[PDB]
Amino acid sequence: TQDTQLIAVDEKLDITTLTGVPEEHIKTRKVRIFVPARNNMQ
Amino acid sequence: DTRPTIRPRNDVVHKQLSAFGQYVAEILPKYVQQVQVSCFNELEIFIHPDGVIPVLTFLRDHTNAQFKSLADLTAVDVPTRQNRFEIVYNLLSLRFNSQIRVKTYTDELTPIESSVTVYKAANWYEREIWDMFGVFFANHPDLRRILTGYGFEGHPFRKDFPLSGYVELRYDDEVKRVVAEPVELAQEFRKFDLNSPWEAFPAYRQPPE
Amino acid sequence: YIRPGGVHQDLPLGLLDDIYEFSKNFSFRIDELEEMLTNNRIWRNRTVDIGVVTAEDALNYGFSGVMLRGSGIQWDLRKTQPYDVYDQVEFDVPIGSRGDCYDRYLCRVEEMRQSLRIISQCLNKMPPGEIKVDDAKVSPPKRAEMKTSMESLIHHFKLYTEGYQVPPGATYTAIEAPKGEFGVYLVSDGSSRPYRCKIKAPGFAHLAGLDKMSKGHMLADVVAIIGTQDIVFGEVDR
Amino acid sequence: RKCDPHIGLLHRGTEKLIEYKTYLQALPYFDRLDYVSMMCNEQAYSLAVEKLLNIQPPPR
Amino acid sequence: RGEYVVAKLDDLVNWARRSSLWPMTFGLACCAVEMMHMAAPRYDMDRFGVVFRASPRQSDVMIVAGTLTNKMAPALRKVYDQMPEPRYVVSMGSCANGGGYYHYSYSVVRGCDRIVPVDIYVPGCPPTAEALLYGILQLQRKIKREKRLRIWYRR
Amino acid sequence: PTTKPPTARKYIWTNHKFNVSGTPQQYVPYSTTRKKIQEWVPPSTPYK
Amino acid sequence: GVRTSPTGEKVTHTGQAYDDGDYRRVRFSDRQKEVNENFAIDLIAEQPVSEVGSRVISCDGGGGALGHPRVYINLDKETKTGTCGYCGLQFRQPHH
Amino acid sequence: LHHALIPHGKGGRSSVSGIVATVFGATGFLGRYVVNHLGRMGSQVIVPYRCEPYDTMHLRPMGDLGQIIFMEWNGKDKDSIRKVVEHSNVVINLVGREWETKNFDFEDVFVKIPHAIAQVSKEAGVEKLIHISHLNADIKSPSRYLRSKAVGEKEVRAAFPEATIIKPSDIFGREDRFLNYFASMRWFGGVPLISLGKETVKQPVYIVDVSKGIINAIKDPDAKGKTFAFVGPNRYLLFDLVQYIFAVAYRPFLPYPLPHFAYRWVGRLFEVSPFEPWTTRDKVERVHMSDMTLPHLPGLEDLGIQATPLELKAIEVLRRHRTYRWLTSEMEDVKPAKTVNI
Amino acid sequence: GTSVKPIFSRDMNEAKRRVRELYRAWYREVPNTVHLFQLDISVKQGRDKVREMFMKNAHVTDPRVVDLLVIKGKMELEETINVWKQRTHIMRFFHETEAPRPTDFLSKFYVGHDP
Amino acid sequence: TYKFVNMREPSMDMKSVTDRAAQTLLWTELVRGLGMTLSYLFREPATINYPFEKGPLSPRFRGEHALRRYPSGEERCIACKLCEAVCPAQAITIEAEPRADGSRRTTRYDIDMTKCIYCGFCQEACPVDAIVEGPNFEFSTETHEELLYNKEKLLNNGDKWEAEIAANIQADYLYR
Amino acid sequence: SKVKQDMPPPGGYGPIDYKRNLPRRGLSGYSMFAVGIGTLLFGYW
Amino acid sequence: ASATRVIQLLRNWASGRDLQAKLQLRYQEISKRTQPPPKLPVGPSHKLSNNYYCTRDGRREAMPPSIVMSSQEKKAVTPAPPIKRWELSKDQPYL
Numbered sequence A: 001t002q003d004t005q006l007i008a009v010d011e012k013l014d015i016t017t018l019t020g021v022p023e024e025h026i027k028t029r030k031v032r033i034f035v036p037a038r039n040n041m042q
Numbered sequence B: 001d002t003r004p005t006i007r008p009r010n011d012v013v014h015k016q017l018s019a020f021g022q023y024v025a026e027i028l029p030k031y032v033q034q035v036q037v038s039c040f041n042e043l044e045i046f047i048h049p050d051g052v053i054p055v056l057t058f059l060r061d062h063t064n065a066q067f068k069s070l071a072d073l074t075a076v077d078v079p080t081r082q083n084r085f086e087i088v089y090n091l092l093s094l095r096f097n098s099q100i101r102v103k104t105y106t107d108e109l110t111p112i113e114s115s116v117t118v119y120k121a122a123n124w125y126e127r128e129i130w131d132m133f134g135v136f137f138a139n140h141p142d143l144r145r146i147l148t149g150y151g152f153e154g155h156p157f158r159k160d161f162p163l164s165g166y167v168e169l170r171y172d173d174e175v176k177r178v179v180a181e182p183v184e185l186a187q188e189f190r191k192f193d194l195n196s197p198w199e200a201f202p203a204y205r206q207p208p209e
Numbered sequence C: 001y002i003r004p005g006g007v008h009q010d011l012p013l014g015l016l017d018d019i020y021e022f023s024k025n026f027s028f029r030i031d032e033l034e035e036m037l038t039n040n041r042i043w044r045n046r047t048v049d050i051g052v053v054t055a056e057d058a059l060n061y062g063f064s065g066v067m068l069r070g071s072g073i074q075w076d077l078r079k080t081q082p083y084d085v086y087d088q089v090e091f092d093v094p095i096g097s098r099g100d101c102y103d104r105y106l107c108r109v110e111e112m113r114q115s116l117r118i119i120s121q122c123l124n125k126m127p128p129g130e131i132k133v134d135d136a137k138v139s140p141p142k143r144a145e146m147k148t149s150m151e152s153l154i155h156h157f158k159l160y161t162e163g164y165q166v167p168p169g170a171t172y173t174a175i176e177a178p179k180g181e182f183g184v185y186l187v188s189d190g191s192s193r194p195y196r197c198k199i200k201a202p203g204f205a206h207l208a209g210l211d212k213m214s215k216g217h218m219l220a221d222v223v224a225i226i227g228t229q230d231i232v233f234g235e236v237d238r
Numbered sequence D: 001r002k003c004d005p006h007i008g009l010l011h012r013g014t015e016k017l018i019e020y021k022t023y024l025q026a027l028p029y030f031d032r033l034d035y036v037s038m039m040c041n042e043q044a045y046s047l048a049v050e051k052l053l054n055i056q057p058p059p060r
Numbered sequence E: 001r002g003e004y005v006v007a008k009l010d011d012l013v014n015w016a017r018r019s020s021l022w023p024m025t026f027g028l029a030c031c032a033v034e035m036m037h038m039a040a041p042r043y044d045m046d047r048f049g050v051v052f053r054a055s056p057r058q059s060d061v062m063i064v065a066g067t068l069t070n071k072m073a074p075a076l077r078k079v080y081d082q083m084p085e086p087r088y089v090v091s092m093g094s095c096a097n098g099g100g101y102y103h104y105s106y107s108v109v110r111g112c113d114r115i116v117p118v119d120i121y122v123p124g125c126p127p128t129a130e131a132l133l134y135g136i137l138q139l140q141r142k143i144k145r146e147k148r149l150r151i152w153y154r155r
Numbered sequence F: 001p002t003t004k005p006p007t008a009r010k011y012i013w014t015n016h017k018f019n020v021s022g023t024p025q026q027y028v029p030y031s032t033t034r035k036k037i038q039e040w041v042p043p044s045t046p047y048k
Numbered sequence G: 001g002v003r004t005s006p007t008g009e010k011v012t013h014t015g016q017a018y019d020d021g022d023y024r025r026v027r028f029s030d031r032q033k034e035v036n037e038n039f040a041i042d043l044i045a046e047q048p049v050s051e052v053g054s055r056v057i058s059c060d061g062g063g064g065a066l067g068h069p070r071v072y073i074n075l076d077k078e079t080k081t082g083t084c085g086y087c088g089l090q091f092r093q094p095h096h
Numbered sequence H: 001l002h003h004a005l006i007p008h009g010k011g012g013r014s015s016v017s018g019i020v021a022t023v024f025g026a027t028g029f030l031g032r033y034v035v036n037h038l039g040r041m042g043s044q045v046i047v048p049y050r051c052e053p054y055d056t057m058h059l060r061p062m063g064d065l066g067q068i069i070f071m072e073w074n075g076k077d078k079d080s081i082r083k084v085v086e087h088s089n090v091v092i093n094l095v096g097r098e099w100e101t102k103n104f105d106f107e108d109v110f111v112k113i114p115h116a117i118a119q120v121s122k123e124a125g126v127e128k129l130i131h132i133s134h135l136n137a138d139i140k141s142p143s144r145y146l147r148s149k150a151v152g153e154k155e156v157r158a159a160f161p162e163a164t165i166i167k168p169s170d171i172f173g174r175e176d177r178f179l180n181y182f183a184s185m186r187w188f189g190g191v192p193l194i195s196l197g198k199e200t201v202k203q204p205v206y207i208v209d210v211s212k213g214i215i216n217a218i219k220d221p222d223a224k225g226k227t228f229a230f231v232g233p234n235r236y237l238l239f240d241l242v243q244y245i246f247a248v249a250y251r252p253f254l255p256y257p258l259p260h261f262a263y264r265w266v267g268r269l270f271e272v273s274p275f276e277p278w279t280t281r282d283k284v285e286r287v288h289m290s291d292m293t294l295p296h297l298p299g300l301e302d303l304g305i306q307a308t309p310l311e312l313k314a315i316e317v318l319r320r321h322r323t324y325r326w327l328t329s330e331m332e333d334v335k336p337a338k339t340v341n342i
Numbered sequence I: 001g002t003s004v005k006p007i008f009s010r011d012m013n014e015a016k017r018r019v020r021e022l023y024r025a026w027y028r029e030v031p032n033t034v035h036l037f038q039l040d041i042s043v044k045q046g047r048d049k050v051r052e053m054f055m056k057n058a059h060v061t062d063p064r065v066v067d068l069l070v071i072k073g074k075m076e077l078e079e080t081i082n083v084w085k086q087r088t089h090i091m092r093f094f095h096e097t098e099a100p101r102p103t104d105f106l107s108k109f110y111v112g113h114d115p
Numbered sequence J: 001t002y003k004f005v006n007m008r009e010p011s012m013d014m015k016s017v018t019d020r021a022a023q024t025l026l027w028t029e030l031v032r033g034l035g036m037t038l039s040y041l042f043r044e045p046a047t048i049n050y051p052f053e054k055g056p057l058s059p060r061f062r063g064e065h066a067l068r069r070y071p072s073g074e075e076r077c078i079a080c081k082l083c084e085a086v087c088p089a090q091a092i093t094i095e096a097e098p099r100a101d102g103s104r105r106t107t108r109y110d111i112d113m114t115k116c117i118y119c120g121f122c123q124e125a126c127p128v129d130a131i132v133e134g135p136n137f138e139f140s141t142e143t144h145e146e147l148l149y150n151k152e153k154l155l156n157n158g159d160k161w162e163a164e165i166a167a168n169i170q171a172d173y174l175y176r
Numbered sequence K: 001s002k003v004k005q006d007m008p009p010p011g012g013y014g015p016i017d018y019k020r021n022l023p024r025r026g027l028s029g030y031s032m033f034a035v036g037i038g039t040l041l042f043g044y045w
Numbered sequence L: 001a002s003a004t005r006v007i008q009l010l011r012n013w014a015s016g017r018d019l020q021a022k023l024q025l026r027y028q029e030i031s032k033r034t035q036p037p038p039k040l041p042v043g044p045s046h047k048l049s050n051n052y053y054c055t056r057d058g059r060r061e062a063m064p065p066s067i068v069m070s071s072q073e074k075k076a077v078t079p080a081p082p083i084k085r086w087e088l089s090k091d092q093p094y095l
């Protein structure tokens, strides 16, 4: 679509090499993906 | 006008800019993907990333556009969108006293051609965007950090970056020099969940996905 | 003090009269400055034909304010795109010809006197009325209705805890700040807090042009070029 | 011959912190931004918020 | 008694210091501009003995006035190390007293004291040109109350 | 104040104080709250 | 009011007092533990109760706009004098 | 453990390590670094002082708010010590000077007050008193300092049986008065060494290791009662050590012999100064005292701290003494000096 | 899809190439900074620190990513040879004041509740 | 409209040329400056001597905070946390509790005078006029800890400057 | 009652000067040279 | 602290103007620091009837950005008519 030497990269994206997150905070930390619960008092 | 609070509406400007929206769209259908005018009379020119150089030259050089002033060059990092970063240009036309906004999208890896040639003002704005966000700009005269401290790692304005950061500083006497330590707040940032659980604007209601 | 939807509260009684007393005296000091430097030969040589920037490059460099009006470009946001009630106020915009360091010094000093005319009109045409938008969902209600009315207290509570939720959208509003074209790019998701706030600092674009100006000039000139540029590093470092 | 203007010796993360504050709480940021043109600074921010809110200030 | 002559030489030395301390030309941010108003004819800092000498080799009190950030913190401590002895550092304004408005950001050191031994703390955002005018004079009282030779004669 | 005396109330101080920094009357910050988590006091009776 | 701790400290209105060991106590030595004597708890008890005769009574707190939001205390329960939740002033019916 | 002393937070400036230290005489070489490590982990340090508070200002910017609170104490008044060590759990003693002021004899600052802290701390309720005394401490040593330290150790141990006694050898560092002593010797003509200083073997130890030694000793639950001897890795004959110092400083070396009685006379002349003496008769004796080897005494590696050879961190002390000529010269320019090893 | 726009490098190999002249430049750069910056470490003590970053950055495989940090390394090298950094900035690579952090589970368990 | 500022071509008449020649040769604009400063030497200095006389302020001045209390003596703060919720610097930190009397007061009201920037929002926030900055611009301390105010210090400031806050608020309670 | 604000007085306000009021003073250029030569001639004489 | 007339002429002559007409130091001409209590006005919407918010709000009357073309003869049109060159000043032409 660009004719800009489109290399077919396949390896899954990993920018942890650049974001600068320190070693402790990148592997050990576990994130949770969830929809927030409706505040029951509302 | 009976209403004393509502901001007045300028339909003449609204029609005027919308016609120019069809203009720019027809001249460059190769890069322009979407064109819209907001309720407060601002025109957004949604272009494709490779159109950063061609489209900008058109609005800067075409007789009927004559946008010869780079107002600003920003990006709004949206973690949601597939290509998170969204590079935004604002141009002011001295001859036609109008303002235009060309917006393009970009992920972390794909580079955007530097607009230094078409707008020499972009050069320093170019450096800031990479420094704060990490959007690398291709074929730039000198891409370098402009705001963060020397040797500072990470891109601060990126949403995933914490508010306080990772690295603190203090003077340590056994080394007689300022040294960096892991961040350790005497008070954590009290985050506030100050969002109403009730819809605010029926006009801007998203479709029921 | 200047808040969205109007100012916080009305001026104290006798404030405008105090403005009138000062404005009377000021023009008798602005010329006093001009007596000290404007015709001084040492100040002239230190500032004439030095740090000269042309028209197109200044326009291309993203310059604004004095950088444009100093080099001949007759541009001023207060006139071209008047915000607030700047249209109902008559004033002149000094435009230079040489574009150098000196021409801007007169441009700034002449901007002093032109501002005095604006102040004279503002004092003489002050209208009666409130100081904030009547909309209590945007501007907090006065303390009087706070303590007697349900709706005012509810609005004051939410306004100072949650704040007004602005509609989603993005805009870039620029004004003729004394340095130059100060502008903000506010992107709002629709919640009670902004999503992105880019701050167009007039000195940011200016300072990038330091090298283009100081070409062949000595270091003492660079000191002079810094001064005329009127940069304060709170705005540029954001 | 060449002047490299290294800036950043005053980079308070203003545009980062504004993300975490309500619109009213973000006002003093602009006050501190260009600390010699204070009212002009708030005037810029106020006009933008009024534009997005579609609300005009009273004549006074 | 040797205590009497020590005290008399004590009073002579400090009185010279408190009536001739020279605040450096060290301004940072919003907190610096109004400090000029202290040096402006309204309050006239110079009348109290001080002169605003640059060149930390020839200055006594360092007016850290403004936001202290990461990129400059090495520059300040180099500057402070260059100042001869005695040297005092008045942390001026809330930004230099712990971080001020931007206490929680990413490139500001939360407090000028984490780099320098910080003397009397003058608060304000900004402190009025008079507010730290007392701050300077209150330091002059601190200089008055020192012992130095009194400790030396009793060391 | 002689012409217009300020309205007097019970809790208003009767002796103004200068800033007491430096002198041993200076103010030291301290937490004004009670303890959140106490501990299960071990019993006095022996093991058996 | 302000009592004295067994160590010698002064208990505040909240009842905070550093205990015997409490290494934090070092700060108060060579200094003082700032305590406000005008305890709010017992500075409102001695105020008399108004004997106003009605069923619903407003309380501006004095000074109108200088006071607190006007609340209507219901003086109907003939066991306990109604008190404004903002200032603590006790109101009661005049026992019929 | 008291609820306010439970360790909390990752070790840092705002962390609650759980140590309430009472470092005595912290306004000095040794005291400067020990509080820095104590401040780094986060620990209320009482840091009593006697000098002008200005000289304690550099002690301030090494801890969180309200962690380095200062107190005024006098060496001959028990009440001052009791106030300083009242609410604490660890007391570090670093008092002691290398000269003889009219108001403080050598035996005073090494027996009298060190007895006073030792006795009062036990009554108050301290549990980890750590008293510091020279490694070479001998009862019948030629120098009163070395005698006073030896009797000092005896008395504190009696009053406080579970008081860890640290026995450092000569300590080198930026403001050490040991490397600087020989570096400053260049001013008075050549470098005078008795019998060329060829019969005196010294084993110096870097300051930071002993500082970490004290910190680890506090954390270690086995330091109770023990007597550690903090010594460096290598022993150097004094002449070769001075050869190393002047090579690192690149100043010319001009050794010349000097009989012991005449050096003692020179030390007497320098003692006359009513200000900080440069060299006392006692100091001359110390330079002659070779560090006695005490292998039975538990050393430094048992704690966990690995000694840093003086060759590595020597330019720190002596870069200042170099003229502008060899100011940027690195470590590898000067070879390591020969080490008479055990 | 899989087709992505590459920054400078066209596969791993010249991406592997670019990390070399960064190491070529860094290695030549170590001894003069130790002299110019008046560092406390030895000339030998700088090469390892230059080295150890490189295979610390070894799990990276994407050619675009590899070229992205070779620019960051070049910029870091750029901001070093003009003495733009200072002694503190360079020394921040040597984690000196920060005390060693444990690694074994038992030591993690003793200090505090953290993984 | 616009006004040109500096292109004034000088005349070339012999009178004008000699005037400029006299100006350059016999320095005149330099003397014009000297006469200016000398005139501005015999004026009255704008200085004021310190504390013996102090600069002028306005009743709505913003300074050291204070926690006032009702005329009865009961504290105004009912701990609604509005001031904490509006604090731009997040300096306000308060926790409440049902007091022994049953009233709703705060256990802790630490205001960190080293964080907040004297916006004055807090005095606008609480609907009972509880927190308010006093006119006392002067509270400089020698140690960092002294600036970190707790509830007790705030009440003490309220009890000390109560005469000023009652008078100043009385003047400006109508403008707001 | 009556709305009272800080409105300007009924007669607006007095005229405010803004134009430059740089005075012109001094002898004519010919006169300056004339008197300057005159002192020289007297000094020589 | 009024200057003696002898030097009143000196300062006036040395600067070629009348200083005493308007001085930088303020005097009794300043407004009194104590003023009568003001009565502030009410806003236009302080009407106890016919003030429904549905006919008064400003936030709920903003539409989403109008879309004019999406990627999913005509005369050339400028964004706005070209500016009209500013006229020269009347109160003060060329300085």
Ligand SMILES: COC1=C(OC)C(=O)C(C/C=C(/C)CC/C=C(/C)CC/C=C(\C)CC/C=C(\C)CC/C=C(/C)CC/C=C(\C)CC/C=C(/C)CC/C=C(\C)CC/C=C(\C)CCC=C(C)C)=C(C)C1=O
Residues within 6 Å of the ligand: E024, E025, E026, E027, E032, E035, E036, E039, E051, E052, E053, E054, E063
């Ligand atoms: C960036 O940020 C900044 C600030 O803030 C952070 C500021 O605020 C300000 C604003 C403040 C200002 C004051 C504005 C001006 C300041 C500037 C930095 C601008 C640049 C300045 C200049 C171009 C001008 C500089 C002028 C100076 C330094 C004045 C010099 C002359 C003087 C008379 C003053 C100094 C006088 C002195 C030191 C006293 C005399 C000296 C002595 C040594 C004492 C006498 C000693 C003896 C007699 C010896 C002993 C012998 C004895 C007693 C004899 C008997 C015994 C025997 C044994 C013989 C600015 C501008 C700023 O940019």
Ligand SMILES: NC(=O)C1=CN([C@@H]2O[C@H](COP(=O)(O)OP(=O)(O)OC[C@H]3O[C@@H](n4cnc5c(N)ncnc54)[C@H](OP(=O)(O)O)[C@@H]3O)[C@@H](O)[C@H]2O)C=CC1
Residues within 6 Å of the ligand: H024, H025, H026, H027, H028, H029, H030, H031, H050, H051, H075, H094, H095, H096, H097, H098, H104, H109, H132, H133, H134, H135, H167, H168, H169, H170, H171, H172, H176, H178
């Ligand atoms: N190489 C070495 O230096 C070695 C030293 N030691 C011992 O370690 C201790 C500390 O050494 P170092 O830090 O180099 O010494 P310094 O002289 O540098 O510091 C001594 C400290 O003790 C204080 N002090 C001394 N005498 C008195 C007194 N009479 N009253 C009150 N305070 C006093 C000093 O206060 P101030 O500064 O105000 O006088 C200062 O805080 C000494 O006992 C020393 O003998 C042991 C082994 C080796």
Ligand code: SF4
Residues within 6 Å of the ligand: D032, E029, E030, E031, E032, E065, E066, E067, E092, E093, E094, E095, E096, E100, E101, E124, E125, E126, E127, J117
């Ligand atoms: S303390 Fe306030 S006035 Fe001073 S620099 Fe910081 S933000 Fe600006």
Ligand code: SF4
Residues within 6 Å of the ligand: J083, J086, J087, J088, J089, J090, J091, J092, J111, J115, J116, J117, J118, J119, J120, J121, J122, J123
């Ligand atoms: S004055 Fe403003 S910033 Fe300071 S504590 Fe109050 S609300 Fe927060």
Ligand code: SF4
Residues within 6 Å of the ligand: J076, J077, J078, J079, J080, J081, J082, J083, J084, J094, J122, J125, J126, J127, J128, J129, J130, J131
């Ligand atoms: S001080 Fe005011 S805003 Fe804060 S809790 Fe009390 S009443 Fe609410």
Ligand SMILES: [Zn+2]
Residues within 6 Å of the ligand: G059, G060, G061, G068, G084, G085, G086, G087, G088, G089
């Ligand atoms: Zn009530």
